Amino acid sequence: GSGVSLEQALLILSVAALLGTTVEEAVKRALWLKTKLGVSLEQAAFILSVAAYLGTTVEEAVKRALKLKTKLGVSLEQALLILFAAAALGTTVEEAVKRALKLKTKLGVSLEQALLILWTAAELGTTVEEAVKRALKLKTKLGVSLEQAQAILVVAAELGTTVEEAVYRALKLKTKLGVSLEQALLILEVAAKLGTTVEEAVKRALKLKTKL
Numbered sequence: 001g002s003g004v005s006l007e008q009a010l011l012i013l014s015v016a017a018l019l020g021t022t023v024e025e026a027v028k029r030a031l032w033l034k035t036k037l038g039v040s041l042e043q044a045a046f047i048l049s050v051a052a053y054l055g056t057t058v059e060e061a062v063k064r065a066l067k068l069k070t071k072l073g074v075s076l077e078q079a080l081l082i083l084f085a086a087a088a089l090g091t092t093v094e095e096a097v098k099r100a101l102k103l104k105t106k107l108g109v110s111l112e113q114a115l116l117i118l119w120t121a122a123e124l125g126t127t128v129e130e131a132v133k134r135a136l137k138l139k140t141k142l143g144v145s146l147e148q149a150q151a152i153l154v155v156a157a158e159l160g161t162t163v164e165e166a167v168y169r170a171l172k173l174k175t176k177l178g179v180s181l182e183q184a185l186l187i188l189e190v191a192a193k194l195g196t197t198v199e200e201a202v203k204r205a206l207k208l209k210t211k212l
Contacts, residue, residue: 003211004041007183010190010205011045017193018052023208033058043077050080053087068093074111081115088122103128113146120150124157138163148181155185158192173198 016026026048034044051061061083068079086096100114107114121131131153138149156166166188173184191201 001041001211004209005211006179006202006205006209007186008041008045009208010183010186010201011042012208013201013204014190014193015045015048018049023204027208037062037076039076043080046077046080046084050084050087053084072097078112078115081112081119085115085118085122088119099128107132109146116147116150120154123154134163142167144181148185151182151185155189155192158189169198177202 012026012030013023015030016023019026019029021029030041030044030048033039033047034041037044037047039047047061047065048058050065051058054061054064056064064083065076065079068074068082069076072079072082074082082093082096082100085100086093089096089099096115096118099118100111103109103117104111104114107117109117117128117131117135120135121128124131126134131150134153135146135149138144138152139146142149144152152163152166152170155170156163159166159169166185169188170181170184173179173187174181177184177187179187187198187201187205190205191198194201194204196204
């Protein structure tokens, strides 16, 4: 798309924070990269985030990702997630993929889902087995996806609250603003990252945004 969704605006606000660059600068940087590679805006923002986590230039991150795609025969998305999971783990990409593949087979999930689980466990400071146990409890209790359950865990950590508090606020946001759960959780997380209120994060994002 050329029109920017709220979802996408929020991701950039997050990336602007991470890079320490104005939102205007982050927009341009994400659009240049989207154009250059012919990828989604979300994927462009991801790449900027991966390079920041790696501590490499964006080109270098792209070079690594393209080489790893060819090596493993995987998508660019998967290669990026492998690099990210490896940067978060502080290990090799080979080790990260090894762990992801074992976990993929165990849980009957995708490699992408497995890599997200590994990254999430690192973000929570727990083992994977613990993170999976806690995510699956939420999945069953609330009737959310495994992905969403993980997102809830992570949002709670960013907020410095329990998962009960995080869910309570997310569902309030859904009812008040008519957003999806995934949206609500992202808003909560972005406001935490920007050092602001829920209202101010959305107000910025709306300035930035064009498509719905």
